[PDB]
Amino acid sequence: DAENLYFQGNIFEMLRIDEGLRLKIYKDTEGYYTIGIGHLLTKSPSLNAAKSELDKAIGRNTNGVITKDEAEKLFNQDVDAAVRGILRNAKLKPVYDSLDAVRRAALINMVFQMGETGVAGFTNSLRMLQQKRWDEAAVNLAKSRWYNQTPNRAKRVITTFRTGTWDAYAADEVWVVGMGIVMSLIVLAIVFGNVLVITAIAKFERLQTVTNYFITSLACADLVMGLAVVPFGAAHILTKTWTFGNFWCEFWTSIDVLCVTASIETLCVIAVDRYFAITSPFKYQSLLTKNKARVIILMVWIVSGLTSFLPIQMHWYRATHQEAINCYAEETCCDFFTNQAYAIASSIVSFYVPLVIMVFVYSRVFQEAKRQLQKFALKEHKALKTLGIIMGTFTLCWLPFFIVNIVHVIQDNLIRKEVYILLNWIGYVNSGFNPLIYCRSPDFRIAFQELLCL
Amino acid sequence: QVQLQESGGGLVQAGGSLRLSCAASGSIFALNIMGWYRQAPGKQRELVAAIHSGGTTNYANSVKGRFTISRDNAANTVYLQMNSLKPEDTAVYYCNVKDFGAIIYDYDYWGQGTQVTVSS
Ligand SMILES: CNC[C@H](O)c1ccc(O)c(O)c1
Ligand code: NA
Ligand code: NA
């Protein structure tokens, strides 16, 4: 058919969108134990029975967890069984034959979902599909229990029956590239911004201050963030898999943790630095030298490395559950599986402690500003808005993740992986947000204008 | 968009006393460093004496023990007491305000500058 363009009209992709790939046994909207791609194991409330049926179907001891290959095999087996079920039935086949490829895919979808007999139960709907009355069949199918139990999927399939096209499912492909370009813009913004900052601090001599040393550290963390973590992550997300190996997977993960930790902790160091610089400027200028600041930076990077590369490369961060073992064994898998200890410890070190210290410090600033040797001016309002942005951005970017990161481990996930990755990236854009917050000094402005000759 | 009114400078005999003064007209952030800098004939701009909004002060190594900086209570006015003046103190004195309203960095406000001449 000379069709090698993305998204070909078929039953497989339709069902992948409707069901969704999951390797571990889960419960559907009804409550039955499902696995893979909409593969019903048993109607038995016992999970052990589901494991028995699963092991019987696959052909080995799966422990409730299967691989991608087995999932696809089960998928094709169930689709083929659905088709054969349609051809074997006396109510489905006369309808199935008098249907175009798309509507055929819709019928195969229904049979795939609720079995042969159940779909054969739709006397009126099939009687209308056979007479090519798509709208009446749509309205009628919109009055079933199937539409009441799974309204969204029912709406999509019914729409597919009505229009006869793939308009109900074609709206996803556009979303894929639609977020792809966003990822591109993210990488570009981060890299450009941080390279600009680092170059500005490095080249000019008027920007050689301790605060700007901390800014240099932060900008380096965000730079390695935008050059390594973000692009490889984008490639991992878009291509649905991982094509670099387990070693580079755990290495990329190490860079992830290291960069995030270093970034946040450096933000904390900046907060404290500015507190001492504003509250007690003379002691700040006398005590904190460039060497002391360098030692501080070294300490931050060491602590960051101790919570990233060390546990990860020593497999200490690794989990014990079956899916984690499979993913660690799988070369194409690079999902983020950890145990309670590592998740909690890393969350505390990387995010929570710097969060607490920063909140306390800025609160100390706002508090001590009101007890100086002094008319409700507007400068204090502007400063309050400034710190509101400084802390507000950081919070809004990294708080949703580390909370979820601590919730996703305390109990087996009711939190979708989509949300996990999404919030992780909401944390990722903070690296690009930082140069627009910590580099608004007049010297930084002039430097930025001179660097690109605007 | 605030202003700095400097006053007090002038000619003075060697060993005589002089009183500088800077008045900050406008809205300045509560946390600031109000001080005095100077430019000697053929020398770079040097810090004379700065005072923080928290009362604490800071003097140069050539004025410590001779110069004493203080500030007003509510009008944000800084007075610089210059006792036992020397011919090397003959310079151009600028009033200065380090504002911390940006928290991350500091906004600088400068005065028009006053001339001080010590008769050698
Ligand atoms: C794969 N994404 C990891 C995430 O960015 C992440 C970063 C730092 C951490 O401490 C952590 O527990 C998770
Ligand atoms: Na092909
Ligand atoms: Na792997």
XYZ file of C-alpha atoms and ligand atoms in Angstrom:
589
model
C 0.000 0.000 0.000
C 3.147 2.160 0.086
C 2.107 3.349 3.546
C 5.076 4.119 5.789
C 3.833 7.446 7.121
C 3.123 7.777 10.847
C -0.307 6.615 12.064
C -1.873 4.038 9.753
C -5.557 3.285 10.286
C -5.684 -0.012 12.172
C -7.037 -1.836 15.230
C -3.670 -2.142 16.992
C -2.820 1.532 17.524
C -6.471 2.239 18.340
C -6.420 -0.372 21.103
C -3.034 0.851 22.325
C -4.523 4.327 22.751
C -7.691 2.969 24.366
C -6.081 0.425 26.702
C -2.495 1.505 27.323
C 0.602 -0.592 27.980
C 1.153 -1.711 31.582
C 3.521 -4.520 32.600
C 2.291 -5.056 36.166
C -1.134 -6.497 37.027
C -3.691 -3.732 37.583
C -7.431 -3.278 38.121
C -9.612 -1.718 35.424
C -12.572 0.603 36.015
C -14.669 -2.490 36.742
C -12.269 -4.134 39.184
C -11.028 -7.161 37.249
C -7.310 -7.973 37.128
C -5.925 -6.751 33.806
C -2.367 -6.777 32.447
C -0.453 -5.893 29.280
C -2.770 -4.195 26.805
C -6.323 -4.777 28.015
C -5.733 -8.478 28.620
C -8.307 -9.860 31.054
C -6.779 -12.476 33.353
C -9.737 -13.526 35.502
C -12.958 -12.260 37.070
C -11.792 -13.786 40.352
C -11.217 -11.285 43.206
C -8.126 -13.273 44.221
C -4.843 -11.881 42.889
C -3.244 -15.319 43.195
C -5.748 -16.683 40.681
C -4.839 -13.840 38.332
C -1.172 -14.754 38.749
C -2.030 -18.386 38.004
C -3.939 -17.511 34.828
C -1.115 -15.157 33.841
C 1.597 -17.777 34.353
C -0.538 -20.295 32.460
C -1.067 -17.900 29.550
C 2.555 -16.763 29.263
C 4.394 -20.007 29.987
C 6.639 -19.165 32.930
C 6.782 -17.822 36.481
C 6.062 -14.132 35.927
C 5.353 -13.046 39.521
C 2.631 -10.737 38.211
C 5.052 -8.913 35.924
C 5.577 -9.536 32.208
C 7.870 -7.997 29.586
C 7.149 -5.829 26.538
C 7.527 -8.733 24.106
C 5.085 -10.914 26.039
C 2.679 -7.980 26.308
C 2.703 -7.442 22.543
C 2.294 -11.180 21.985
C -0.738 -11.233 24.289
C -2.041 -8.146 22.497
C -1.892 -9.727 19.039
C -3.257 -12.998 20.417
C -6.252 -11.188 21.915
C -6.857 -9.156 18.750
C -6.719 -12.281 16.581
C -8.980 -14.107 19.040
C -11.384 -11.172 18.815
C -11.421 -11.319 15.009
C -11.904 -15.093 14.971
C -14.650 -14.635 17.548
C -16.336 -12.172 15.207
C -16.050 -14.493 12.208
C -17.360 -17.440 14.242
C -20.459 -15.591 15.455
C -23.688 -15.462 13.440
C -24.573 -11.921 14.527
C -21.149 -10.306 14.162
C -19.970 -11.645 10.792
C -22.828 -10.324 8.603
C -22.157 -6.934 10.200
C -18.369 -7.299 10.093
C -18.369 -8.000 6.348
C -20.630 -5.037 5.574
C -18.201 -2.662 7.294
C -15.265 -0.629 6.001
C -11.796 -1.116 7.508
C -12.220 1.641 10.106
C -15.644 0.570 11.374
C -14.360 -3.001 11.269
C -11.601 -1.832 13.600
C -14.278 -0.306 15.833
C -16.208 -3.585 16.011
C -12.992 -5.514 16.657
C -12.332 -2.964 19.405
C -15.698 -3.661 21.056
C -15.218 -7.438 20.802
C -11.679 -7.047 22.141
C -13.032 -5.167 25.144
C -16.183 -7.011 26.218
C -15.923 -10.362 24.444
C -17.762 -11.941 21.522
C -21.100 -12.769 23.164
C -21.440 -9.374 24.840
C -20.987 -7.519 21.558
C -23.317 -10.024 19.899
C -25.815 -8.865 22.518
C -26.116 -5.506 20.759
C -28.986 -6.623 18.525
C -30.297 -3.179 17.571
C -26.891 -1.518 17.193
C -25.578 -4.249 14.893
C -28.890 -4.225 13.020
C -28.305 -0.527 12.364
C -24.624 -0.924 11.489
C -25.577 -3.604 8.976
C -28.062 -1.234 7.337
C -25.368 1.467 7.392
C -27.169 3.735 9.856
C -24.154 5.117 11.703
C -25.767 8.028 13.554
C -28.705 6.005 14.879
C -26.279 3.288 15.963
C -24.169 5.981 17.630
C -27.088 7.426 19.599
C -28.244 3.912 20.499
C -24.776 2.799 21.616
C -24.726 5.983 23.699
C -27.522 4.454 25.794
C -25.797 1.267 26.964
C -24.039 0.172 30.151
C -20.817 0.118 28.139
C -21.157 3.871 27.654
C -21.910 4.312 31.359
C -18.913 2.330 32.628
C -16.252 3.690 30.262
C -17.646 6.960 28.815
C -14.457 8.242 27.146
C -13.436 5.129 25.212
C -17.085 4.528 24.346
C -17.283 8.086 23.014
C -14.181 7.568 20.868
C -15.318 4.209 19.459
C -18.860 5.474 18.828
C -17.399 8.519 17.067
C -15.282 6.141 14.983
C -18.438 4.240 14.025
C -20.286 7.448 13.157
C -17.740 9.434 11.147
C -16.040 6.368 9.691
C -12.714 8.152 10.038
C -9.972 8.282 12.667
C -10.778 11.807 13.877
C -11.275 10.487 17.424
C -7.743 9.064 17.548
C -5.824 11.316 15.146
C -5.743 14.106 17.744
C -2.964 12.343 19.662
C -0.245 12.211 17.005
C -0.394 16.010 16.864
C 0.173 16.069 20.624
C 3.328 13.965 20.331
C 5.255 16.403 18.128
C 3.377 19.203 19.868
C 5.245 18.388 23.072
C 8.403 17.469 21.163
C 8.917 21.037 19.961
C 8.296 22.187 23.532
C 11.114 19.919 24.715
C 13.333 21.394 21.997
C 12.548 24.940 23.144
C 13.305 23.889 26.724
C 16.747 22.524 25.829
C 17.540 25.590 23.717
C 16.454 28.042 26.424
C 18.356 26.272 29.215
C 21.611 25.827 27.285
C 21.566 29.338 25.793
C 20.726 31.017 29.095
C 23.266 29.184 31.238
C 26.075 29.435 28.671
C 25.311 33.150 28.509
C 25.493 33.506 32.308
C 28.703 31.481 32.698
C 30.356 33.375 29.842
C 29.267 36.689 31.361
C 30.702 35.906 34.799
C 33.880 34.405 33.328
C 34.763 37.147 30.834
C 33.987 40.330 32.783
C 35.933 41.391 35.880
C 33.168 43.505 37.424
C 31.122 40.322 37.843
C 33.741 38.609 40.001
C 31.854 38.422 43.297
C 31.129 35.575 45.729
C 27.408 35.705 44.964
C 28.352 35.461 41.288
C 30.573 32.471 42.086
C 27.502 30.756 43.507
C 25.637 31.896 40.385
C 28.409 30.277 38.344
C 27.932 26.990 40.202
C 24.151 27.103 39.743
C 24.548 27.956 36.055
C 26.955 25.045 35.627
C 24.489 22.641 37.231
C 21.699 23.921 34.981
C 24.037 23.782 31.978
C 24.859 20.110 32.491
C 21.115 19.743 33.074
C 20.304 21.183 29.652
C 23.146 19.456 27.809
C 22.895 15.928 29.215
C 19.783 15.118 31.264
C 17.068 16.922 29.287
C 18.047 15.860 25.735
C 18.575 12.175 26.569
C 15.345 12.257 28.560
C 13.523 13.707 25.564
C 14.961 10.978 23.340
C 13.901 8.369 25.902
C 10.354 9.739 26.054
C 9.693 10.372 22.359
C 11.148 7.124 20.998
C 9.136 5.168 23.600
C 12.290 3.241 24.578
C 15.977 3.598 25.475
C 18.774 2.923 22.986
C 22.063 3.510 24.815
C 22.405 0.622 27.264
C 22.039 0.010 30.995
C 25.376 1.611 31.852
C 24.537 4.878 30.094
C 21.058 4.629 31.597
C 22.311 4.595 35.190
C 24.971 7.140 34.228
C 22.340 9.490 32.805
C 20.309 8.908 35.977
C 23.391 9.760 38.035
C 23.801 13.002 36.094
C 20.097 13.701 36.689
C 20.264 13.331 40.478
C 23.654 15.062 40.702
C 22.561 18.081 38.655
C 19.221 18.515 40.431
C 20.778 18.188 43.890
C 23.651 20.542 43.044
C 21.226 23.079 41.566
C 18.842 23.173 44.535
C 21.570 23.105 47.191
C 23.383 25.883 45.328
C 20.118 27.846 45.435
C 20.139 27.335 49.205
C 23.747 28.540 49.419
C 22.745 31.617 47.403
C 19.868 32.294 49.805
C 22.098 32.106 52.890
C 24.795 34.136 51.121
C 22.370 36.954 50.350
C 20.997 36.805 53.889
C 24.439 37.394 55.386
C 25.275 39.921 52.664
C 22.183 42.001 53.441
C 21.832 41.605 57.221
C 25.500 41.745 58.245
C 27.406 43.100 55.203
C 30.690 43.991 56.924
C 31.134 40.610 58.601
C 30.003 39.049 55.317
C 32.734 40.877 53.421
C 35.380 40.148 56.057
C 34.681 36.446 56.651
C 33.487 34.913 53.373
C 36.459 35.006 50.998
C 36.616 33.567 47.479
C 38.555 30.551 48.752
C 35.971 29.857 51.452
C 33.234 30.145 48.826
C 35.140 27.732 46.588
C 35.398 25.267 49.470
C 31.646 25.661 49.985
C 31.032 24.893 46.294
C 33.296 21.845 46.493
C 31.345 20.668 49.547
C 28.018 21.126 47.748
C 29.205 19.161 44.714
C 30.631 16.455 46.991
C 27.362 16.070 48.906
C 25.528 16.060 45.572
C 27.849 13.373 44.221
C 27.450 11.266 47.357
C 23.684 11.137 46.833
C 23.879 10.511 43.087
C 26.807 8.672 41.488
C 27.878 6.749 44.598
C 24.611 4.951 45.415
C 23.563 4.529 41.775
C 26.824 3.112 40.404
C 26.947 0.778 43.415
C 23.359 -0.359 42.778
C 22.349 0.787 46.272
C 19.436 2.828 44.915
C 17.993 -0.235 43.190
C 14.597 -1.637 44.159
C 13.708 -5.285 44.748
C 10.265 -5.734 43.174
C 9.941 -7.830 40.014
C 9.346 -5.046 37.483
C 12.426 -3.220 38.763
C 14.544 -6.353 38.323
C 13.168 -6.795 34.804
C 13.904 -3.172 33.896
C 17.435 -3.428 35.291
C 17.824 -6.576 33.192
C 16.231 -5.012 30.108
C 18.677 -2.965 28.022
C 15.878 -0.927 26.453
C 14.398 -0.018 29.840
C 15.522 3.056 31.760
C 12.619 3.777 34.101
C 13.358 5.222 37.530
C 12.867 2.529 40.177
C 14.110 3.112 43.731
C 13.481 1.878 47.276
C 12.012 3.790 50.224
C 15.401 4.544 51.784
C 16.977 6.082 48.686
C 13.852 8.013 47.680
C 13.402 9.492 51.159
C 17.102 10.248 51.699
C 17.589 11.802 48.258
C 14.401 13.849 48.607
C 15.522 15.127 52.013
C 19.072 15.990 50.918
C 18.307 17.410 47.467
C 15.055 19.291 48.077
C 13.506 19.350 51.560
C 16.493 20.585 53.589
C 17.373 23.372 51.112
C 13.660 24.240 51.019
C 13.483 24.572 54.810
C 16.719 26.562 55.053
C 15.665 28.913 52.233
C 12.211 29.506 53.728
C 13.715 30.196 57.156
C 16.382 32.502 55.703
C 14.071 34.594 53.508
C 11.580 34.776 56.374
C 14.459 36.074 58.491
C 15.127 38.727 55.841
C 11.494 39.847 55.622
C 11.346 39.834 59.433
C 14.583 41.708 60.099
C 13.746 44.306 57.453
C 10.910 45.522 59.684
C 13.147 46.130 62.710
C 15.764 48.529 61.331
C 16.499 52.119 62.366
C 13.372 53.461 60.662
C 6.275 55.119 55.958
C 4.598 52.341 53.911
C 6.701 52.991 50.789
C 6.624 51.041 47.524
C 10.186 49.702 47.647
C 9.285 47.095 50.269
C 6.367 45.951 48.111
C 8.672 45.538 45.114
C 11.174 43.597 47.223
C 8.380 41.400 48.574
C 7.260 40.680 45.013
C 10.885 39.928 44.125
C 11.320 37.324 46.867
C 7.832 36.126 45.975
C 9.150 35.303 42.513
C 12.458 33.913 43.800
C 10.840 31.433 46.185
C 7.570 31.049 44.287
C 9.205 29.838 41.077
C 11.413 27.311 42.874
C 8.463 26.016 44.899
C 6.055 25.837 41.956
C 8.696 23.987 39.927
C 10.199 21.454 42.344
C 7.655 20.979 45.157
C 5.048 18.985 43.178
C 7.692 16.432 42.163
C 9.422 15.661 45.469
C 6.055 15.402 47.209
C 4.909 12.898 44.585
C 8.368 11.297 44.688
C 7.750 10.623 48.384
C 4.133 9.535 47.859
C 4.894 7.198 44.956
C 7.010 5.069 47.312
C 4.992 5.076 50.557
C 2.234 3.102 48.820
C 2.089 1.204 45.525
C 1.385 3.784 42.840
C -2.093 5.175 42.378
C -0.058 8.027 40.917
C 0.390 7.692 37.144
C 3.903 7.552 35.673
C 2.811 10.253 33.227
C 2.315 12.602 36.170
C 5.676 11.582 37.633
C 7.621 12.385 34.465
C 5.556 15.520 33.834
C 6.256 16.953 37.298
C 9.892 15.891 36.957
C 10.101 18.053 33.831
C 8.228 20.886 35.543
C 11.211 20.646 37.859
C 13.500 20.537 34.818
C 12.400 23.908 33.399
C 13.510 25.587 36.636
C 17.070 25.291 35.316
C 16.022 27.548 32.453
C 14.069 29.803 34.806
C 17.046 30.469 37.107
C 19.077 32.825 34.865
C 16.007 35.076 34.571
C 15.909 35.469 38.359
C 19.476 35.417 39.671
C 21.069 37.578 36.968
C 19.097 40.828 36.888
C 21.863 43.062 38.248
C 22.896 46.131 36.192
C 26.323 44.565 35.626
C 24.694 41.353 34.406
C 22.475 43.436 32.111
C 25.378 45.354 30.560
C 27.371 42.129 30.255
C 24.488 40.393 28.477
C 24.088 43.337 26.102
C 27.804 43.437 25.274
C 28.209 39.661 24.864
C 25.857 39.464 21.873
C 26.329 43.081 20.725
C 22.670 44.129 20.787
C 14.523 57.993 41.096
C 15.713 59.265 44.481
C 18.034 62.182 45.242
C 21.105 62.704 47.430
C 21.797 66.136 48.925
C 25.419 66.566 49.995
C 26.508 69.473 52.193
C 29.345 70.530 54.480
C 32.439 70.415 52.286
C 34.882 73.279 51.842
C 38.357 74.593 52.627
C 39.940 73.604 55.947
C 43.257 74.086 57.765
C 45.493 71.095 58.500
C 44.205 69.535 61.712
C 40.851 71.289 61.562
C 37.504 69.515 61.810
C 34.783 69.257 59.171
C 31.253 67.833 59.076
C 29.854 66.206 55.933
C 26.167 65.384 55.477
C 24.017 63.484 52.983
C 20.218 63.578 52.830
C 18.374 60.866 50.904
C 15.181 62.248 49.374
C 12.972 59.380 48.238
C 11.889 55.827 49.014
C 14.746 53.460 49.856
C 14.505 49.807 50.940
C 14.676 49.216 54.703
C 17.946 47.287 54.407
C 20.720 49.511 53.063
C 24.305 50.749 53.378
C 24.649 54.533 53.443
C 28.239 55.762 53.294
C 30.952 58.033 51.921
C 33.595 57.432 49.249
C 36.363 59.739 47.994
C 38.680 60.470 45.068
C 42.152 61.843 45.787
C 44.072 63.751 43.070
C 45.604 60.951 41.004
C 44.064 58.112 43.008
C 41.128 55.747 42.460
C 37.763 55.997 44.222
C 38.206 54.786 47.803
C 35.691 53.978 50.548
C 35.800 56.518 53.369
C 33.116 55.370 55.791
C 29.896 53.381 55.413
C 27.086 52.746 57.893
C 24.561 49.914 57.667
C 20.861 50.405 58.426
C 21.455 48.126 61.406
C 23.661 50.685 63.125
C 26.985 48.958 62.441
C 29.729 51.010 60.779
C 32.865 50.508 58.676
C 35.882 52.769 58.172
C 39.007 52.716 56.013
C 42.424 51.970 57.519
C 43.534 55.572 56.984
C 40.508 57.214 58.606
C 39.782 54.780 61.444
C 40.377 56.687 64.671
C 39.937 60.074 63.022
C 36.620 59.803 61.168
C 33.283 58.929 62.773
C 30.123 58.234 60.775
C 26.576 58.323 62.156
C 23.030 58.718 60.837
C 19.716 60.445 61.530
C 16.843 58.595 63.194
C 14.026 58.811 60.636
C 14.947 61.142 57.761
C 17.692 58.841 56.427
C 20.440 61.455 56.746
C 24.077 60.475 57.269
C 26.580 62.714 59.058
C 30.335 62.228 58.661
C 32.516 63.683 61.420
C 36.029 64.378 60.137
C 38.479 65.312 62.894
C 42.227 65.984 62.624
C 42.271 66.377 58.837
C 45.422 65.751 56.803
C 46.723 66.966 53.405
C 46.214 63.446 52.017
C 42.525 63.652 52.937
C 42.113 66.348 50.284
C 39.743 64.611 47.879
C 36.311 64.535 46.253
C 33.761 63.022 48.631
C 30.715 61.221 47.230
C 27.644 60.167 49.194
C 26.493 56.619 48.497
C 23.483 54.370 49.079
C 23.590 50.591 48.649
C 19.985 49.414 48.311
C 19.076 45.766 48.932
C 15.580 45.907 47.439
C 16.591 43.398 44.773
C 17.837 40.935 47.415
C 20.056 39.066 44.936
C 21.992 42.193 43.956
C 22.366 45.793 45.122
C 21.309 49.097 43.553
C 23.773 51.979 43.924
C 22.769 55.613 44.377
C 25.409 58.345 44.151
C 25.636 61.989 45.176
C 26.794 64.975 43.140
C 30.041 65.039 45.110
C 31.608 67.689 47.331
C 35.138 69.092 47.228
C 37.276 69.052 50.374
C 40.604 70.891 50.486
C 43.076 70.601 53.361
C 45.662 73.393 53.515
C 49.094 71.756 53.696
C 14.773 10.370 36.571
N 14.369 11.618 37.234
C 15.022 11.712 38.547
C 14.618 13.000 39.267
O 14.981 14.131 38.470
C 15.245 13.064 40.509
C 16.264 13.987 40.735
C 16.893 14.056 41.975
C 16.492 13.189 42.984
O 17.057 13.192 44.222
C 15.479 12.268 42.761
O 15.146 11.456 43.800
C 14.848 12.199 41.524
Na 7.901 0.227 7.015
Na 17.734 -1.127 32.032
